[model samples]
Target: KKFPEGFLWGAATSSYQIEGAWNEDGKGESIWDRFTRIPGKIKNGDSGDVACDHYHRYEQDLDLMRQLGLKTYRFSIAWARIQPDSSRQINQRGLDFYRRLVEGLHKRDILPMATLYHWDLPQWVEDEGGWLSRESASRFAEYTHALVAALGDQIPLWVTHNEPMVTVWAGYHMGLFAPGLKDPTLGGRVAHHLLLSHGQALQAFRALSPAGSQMGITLNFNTIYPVSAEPADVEAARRMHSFQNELFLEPLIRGQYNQATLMAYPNLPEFIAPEDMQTISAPIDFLGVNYYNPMRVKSSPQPPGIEVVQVESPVTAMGWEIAPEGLYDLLMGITRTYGKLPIYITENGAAFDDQPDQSGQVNDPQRVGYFQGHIGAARRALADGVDLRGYYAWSLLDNFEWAEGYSKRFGIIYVDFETQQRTLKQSAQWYRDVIANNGLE
Candidate 1:
């Protein structure tokens, strides 16, 4: 069966991951800029200092998107690029760059989905306590105001935040991402601030954006299941799901954290004001979900009382298990829990050790199979009466992969880091055919 007509078919990339003119375009430092340079922080000591160089080669990338017959292009705007310093001066050149980019996409008949924040916190904000400070939430709204004032008309879709849970858990709790710090209590506070920022940005969009503009937040969730039917294992899965999935979805949809989710983090309540839930749960037009795999949980004696077990399924380059059914389960679960709403799979892709052959063709059959299986899962969700609207693959090019650095390639279009050359993998052709056909046969 074909996907519903007018379904959005697109690919996604973030500014810091693809745009590599880091210091050239009046762009100030980001937490990543500082974190990547520190000794032993990123794998192979790789930095995004010259990633794909998409800042200068976006036209070529857009041409590639057109070649793939994309109907939408979901990319992020760099906050640091817009307001490079603490003075928060509106940079015309920065705005001009995005304006040109959006116009180019429009010329190619592609919708532009702009994400306001994709975890690239400006260095100036980090200096002033970053998301740890309540003031950062207000500043986020101000930044959103500046962005909408300049390019709101061109952008039909706006995503307030991309995976706030990652920013909190990976960056703060695990100290594995930017502004890395291993602080358990601070993670809860940071998560609250990030959600507040999303709320503020939604408010800003409502006030400043054009009529019919749609705004939402993108969250990454791993469908979790118990390894065994034991009561301990069942309890572990429940608690894990609440902390990982419900922590963000509850306040965003229900306007308040449920008692169970609140009990997971002692410090989180101290940061959450009673009035904040109303803003956090402000009605959003859609919810963006980024799913990769399902995690099997078993009871543990640790604080979280759950431990993720390594699944014996085919794994990607990142060692994440391949579970396409997880996507269908996730969509169905959200519908059952949060009620039916337009949902977009904003990010879904896997990294592989992709390389070009003697004919200069990059063939990644694993990624092709991955996409096909997942798209099939999405199709099943649609059949099951889920209001699934769109799917944007995780990345457009092989750029920086955060702490794993440039080692993991998640892009359908492989980027030769040394020469900045882009080669369309077999997966790209498969996606092009899927987009052209509007569904897989």
Candidate 2:
């Protein structure tokens, strides 16, 4: 009937998505700055250079959060901002900016969840070979040490990296995200480096963080289902699951990729050092699951992988199918496979065409329904004995979506890009009420 007591209610935002002033306060250029400059990369020829101007207007956003009664805020610290040009250099101004942000969240009694890397790698670092190079993992550990030294006392929760799967698969193999490179083996290499980076960062965090602080990594997941009872179709489902879920989850939790997946790549072992497994499986305080939709796969001649067959289910503006049961299944699957551990729905939301009516009021029934169904599914997971600790909506504001740019709206609060006015959508009001009641009323 109600969420467990002290269930955390919060929202999330990445640096490049919401924080504009891409070059202000001596901030170094991120790979995103370079990627967006190339024409035809992002929708509408858009760039994050002046996104929501959150860099200049975070105070106003805090007021919005206060209105929504958020218990916590999940935000990413840009690697570019922390070490603009080189790993050895520390930008005090950039560090001070985050300190001020943490101070404000504390003033309002909101716990801050900070992510160290959210795909905003400094361009200089990318030039040094980005995540593909083994040395980048060590570089990340150095950055983690610097950040802990600067603000570890204030931010109690830390995510080492947000969705390394997307950062590697989408950015390396698919060539869709920043530092776009299409290659066969690049994704595998990037994956190993990112996990190593997370492990090293965790080690540094353990040494430096104040007692009682928590640290973990967020991984994006999509439940894959076979289209039919055919053995080929079911095998296709397994392949897709291995690529999306097991690829990161197995290594992060158990320190070894499944035998099937390793057999496919065959070369991943070359990237791993003899002592890497012990570091990778050192155990985490929690696992952050970012659930968006479910994938239905069929055996096909189309790809090097399975074919995604679209179902008749209703979809979001981003064309992702709405399947709350998939979330329940994903959570249950995690617990069933790996046993009990703290889990958080670190990212869940739908993008819709949010049209503000003539009266300057935005009423989004679709977004409201999305949250209602998904949150209900989460509540079901809790009932089923999943140690679900918290939920953070995918985003707090409508800002620059990477390749999609401002073409989509995932925010509960409608952002008028031209005037920078924030109007609470009906969903936002509903979310506030949910927070007040601590569950669906």
Candidate 3:
């Protein structure tokens, strides 16, 4: 069955992941800029300093989208570019670049879906306690308020924050990404502040956006499965699921944090105010589900109560297991538990170390198969009455992946790093036809 008429077909990218020109036209330094400066932080010495050079080449990039017949393109705004030192200061030159990009997107008949924050906090903000500070929530909302004043007229779809769990867990607790820190207790408090910011930002968006605009926060989900049927394994799976999935979803959908998660972080109560959860739970228009792979866990005496075990399936370049049926499980699970909410598969794609052929075309049958199986799962979900609305490939261009740096390739349109040339891989060609047909046949 075909997707319903007007189902948006799109691709996604982020500013720090794609747009280079790190310090031009009064752009302030991002935490990533500083994080990369620390020895051994980025592993391969790869930097976002010249990623895709999308800042100067957006017009050409827009043309690439035109060639693909994309209905929408999801890109993020750099908070540092807008408010260099603080959210209070406004930068017109920084705003102008995005304005031009948005205008180009409009001219090509592509709807611009703007993500206000995609884990690129300004270095100045990080210096002031980052997401651990309640003040950081206000700072985020202030930046959102100001952005709507500048580009609100142009962008129709808004994502308050993308994958806040990764930002909280990977950066704060695991020390894996920018503004890296390592503290299990810090993760819970950080998650609280991120949701607080999202709620505040949503209020600002409601007051400032164009009449047609809709807003939501993107949360990454993994369908949790226990490796064994033992009570300890089942309990471990529940704790893992609550920590990763329910921490964000429960607060956004039901206005409460998970009790199981609270047990893991007894210090979290110190940060939450009496009224914060009400703001965090405020209603929004849609949910962005970013699913890559699911996890199978076994009981552990570890802090989080579970250790990830390899799934009995094929793995991608990132070593994430391939389970397209997991996507169907997630969509169905969310609706059954969270009510009839609209949804978009905001980011879904796999990485493969693809190389170009002698004829200059890139063939990636694995990624093509990945998309086919996942899209088929989405079709099954739709047939079962899930309100799945749109699908955006994880990325449009091969750029600076966060921790893996540029080592892995997740783009449908492959990039020649030295020349900055873009070529549509076989997956991109497959995707174009899928978009034209509105579903995989």
Candidate 4:
């Protein structure tokens, strides 16, 4: 698989999932810190307080990446660790840790991609009504300004938000994740503010970062496959696309919400103030596309609306499908619909119950096949005229997986969460070879 002239290949991870030290070293409590204390919020009472211990072992992790021959590394700063309350009080130590982290990555000559928000909100923001409130937008802007003011020079590439739809759906609609709430209307509202805050943060970053600092947002997108080409199935696919893709992208890039989706909700357009749309539509530099799998949605005109029915396929440990064409469809469709934006596969990998075999290696040939197929699709998209810039695997190491706890492993590196030990998986070796060759055989 060949890529564009300067395509990037890297791995991505978040703070809460990798970095431990929940309350250590002057760090304040995040919504995850509070949410984990609740009964049954996470599986088997697992919390990320000591996940992989990346906070203490970042140097080791960086060494691992250097060995892997990664071109770029995408990581997020924990808001709770930096500024728990979006207020005047800021943790200088927390800021220094990331400053040193970036500087260390640069010393090894690895490009650092900083993502501002990755679903780990400060508890105070959630207490003040979370992303559902308009205030959250301005608060996010303020927070953005605060961070970029200090470290914008050190960190050149910036991402506004990571997978807003998942945060909205998991946090509000399903109530299976942090700051749990199970209201569809509130979930929709949170979805709106997540994009709103993303725009505000983008503007705020520009106001702070010097010229040439690339800015973008990471969106977790999936192609919607209908059960059949029948009218009901076709409509199901359309609705899924509108909800998952158009719901956020249209508002941010196009400065408008989907008419059909708006009608589905009460008083939707009125929710968007004129100025909000103006800010939301501010021109962005790039887009980060995170793909996992496509969903088979059957038209459910019944009660709770269109339902995402799962199709029969080999499942990952996370129970997600193993469809790679969904990725090809996403790249081609984005190019076709949105018109040639520079896109990167921000997060794409599967979680399996990987365990070491007798040979001190975790053989995940299925994941290798998955990556091969999808990376092939990505190359095809580029050849077919999509301005694809890069591809970053979902994770560099096996860390915390939100609601699933440590049960699902998506890492190229097998992390012994028990002892905080890191071992390179077979895919990591394969990825290094692929990156070295810049193509696969």
Candidate 5:
């Protein structure tokens, strides 16, 4: 079956992952900028210091998107770039860069979908308690207002944040990403503040946006599957779901956090004040789901009682399992649990060890198959009456994969990091055909 008419087809990229002019043009330092400077924080000592140089070569990338027949292009505006030093002062040159990018997209007949935050918190903000500080919400609102004031006229879709879980858990609790802290209690507090910022930003977007403009948040979801039929395993899966999925979704969609999740972190309530949930659940225009893998969990001897198990499935270059059925189940689950809200697969793609042939053509059959299977899963959801509105490939270019650094390649378009040359992979050609046909053949 064909996808619905007018469904958006596009690709996604975040500013910090692609734009490398970190300190140029009055751009303030980001947590990533500082984090990458710390010895051994990022793999291979690779940083976004020169990531694809998209900060200077956006015109070439925009032309590439046009050639790919992208109907929409989802990208992020760097908070640090716009308000260097985390001050209230707006940077005109920073704003102008994005203005030109948006204008170029418009010239190519591609719609612009802008994400306000993609985990690049200004270094000053991190210095003042990062997301753990209650003040970060207001700070985020200030940034959102300024950004929308500058570019709201051009962007029809606004995403307040991308994957709150990643920023909170991976960055704070696990010490895998920036500001590398490993305190679970602090992680809980950080999560609340992040959600609060999203609410505040959404409010600003609502009040500031044009009539037809829409606002949403992008959340990464993994369907939790118990590895055993044991009651403990089943209970572990339930708890894992509460922690991973419901913790964010319940607050954003249902105006509350799961009690199980709350019990997991007894101190979380201190951060969520009266009426915060009202703001968090404030009716969003749509939802963006980023599905990469389903959680394979088992009963643990330790406290939370669930531990993720490695699944025996074909994996990506990142070693994440390639499970297209997980995407299908995830979409259907959202509609059943959160009601039939419009959804976009806002970020979906895989990293692979890709290399160019002698003819300069990069062939990534795995990534091509990954897209084919996931799009088919999305088609299945559409056939099942899911209001899955659109799909954006995870990235348009290979870029700075946080923590993994430039070691991972998730883009359909391959970037020769050494020479800054761009090569469209076989997956890119496949995606072009998919976009042109608007369905799988």
Candidate 6:
């Protein structure tokens, strides 16, 4: 397989999902920090209060990443840790911890991709109407400026937010996750505010960014396919495309909402002012894409609701379809629809119910095969004139997953949550060799 000459090989992790000590050392409760405590919200009564203790075990964790020969590592700073109240009173100890994480990554010659917001907003924001209120946009900009001022000089790659659509759908629309709310009006309002927040945060970062700094938002998009090629079925696929993939990116990139989406949310938002669009589209270095699988849909007399349609296909333990061809299609589709911007496959991996036998060794040939197919698809995308630059596996460690809690495992590593010990799965060692060789051999 072939890869771009400077293609980055790395792994990704979110702070709250992996880092324990959610409320210690001046750290306030994030939405996730509070949401998991609600009765019957998470599995096994598991919360992230002591998730892998990454705050204390980061040094050893970095050692594992370095041993894997990863060239880059994408991690996020917890906003609740820095600004517990969404105000100016910043926490020195909180910032100090992330500073050390960046320094450690720099020491290992790994490029650090810092995401400013990764779905764990401070509880104060939720208290102030959360993502549902329009004020959240300016608040996010304030948060962005503070974050950049603290660590912008050290980190080169930055992302404003991760998966805004999913954040609104799962977090607000479905009542299945944090700050659980279940109102369509609130959901649409939240989606608009989140995109407004993205624009404002982009504006803020550009104002504070140094010469070499690169910043963009991360999007999780899937190719929408009709269950059958019937006219209504194809129309359903189109609607899904407009709703899921385009709702966020089109406004940021093209500066307007797609008309097709108005059928679902008739009052299309013109939340982005002209000046805001200029800043949002201000010469981004690359787009970060998180692709997992495509959505297969069909037209219905009524909307199919937010429930995901799981098709019958080979799947990992997480039940996500094992579809590598979707990656190739998505790259080309993005290039075609959004222009010829370079892209980074930021998050792409699935969870399997992994466990060790009596000998304490993992045998996940499924994961190994998944990586191969996806990496090959990435290579195919590159060959077909897509300016694909890099790919990062979903995670480096297994920790507290949001909503589902620790029941699902997506990491290439086997994390014993009870003992807080890390064991390198066979897939980890295989990924190490893949990185060393620059491709699957």
How do the residues 140-243 of candidate 6 rate in per-residue lDDT, one tens digit apiece?
Answer: 88888887887887888888888887887888778887778776556556766777787787777778866577887789988887777688787778777888
Instruction: Give candidates' CA RMSD values in order.
Output: 1.1, 1.3, 1.3, 1.5, 1.1, 1.8
lDDT of 1 by residue, 161-266 (tens): 9999999888888999988989877877887888899998899889885766788999999998899999999998988888888788998998877666667667
Estimate TM-scores for all models.
0.98, 0.98, 0.97, 0.97, 0.98, 0.96
Q: How much lDDT does each candidate structure score?
A: 0.90, 0.89, 0.90, 0.85, 0.89, 0.83
Candidate 6 lDDT for residue 309: 65
Instruction: Encode model 5's per-residue lDDT on 1-441: one tens digit a residue.
Output: 778799899999999999999999999999889889998888999999999999899999999999899999999999888888745688889999999999999999999999998989988888777787899899999999988888787888889999998987888888988878888778678878888999999889888867667889999999888998989999889888888887889888888878886886789887778889898889899998998988899998987677999866699888799989999988888899889998988999999999899999999999999999999999999899789888999989999999999889999999999999999999999999998898998
Clash pairs, candidate 4, are none
Note the clash tally of each candidate: 0, 0, 0, 0, 0, 0
lDDT of 4 at 225: 81
> lDDT: which is higher, 3 or 6?
3
Question: What's the distance in Å from true for residue 392, model 3?
Answer: 0.5
Q: Which stretches of candidate 1 lie over 4 Å from their true place?
A: none
Instruction: Enumerate residue pairs that collide in model 1.
Output: none
How many collisions between residues are there in candidate 2?
A: 0
Which scores greater on TM-score, model 3 or model 6?
3
lDDT of 3 at 234: 95
TM-score of 1: 0.98
Q: TM-score for candidate 2, please give it.
A: 0.98
- What's model 5's overall lDDT? 0.89
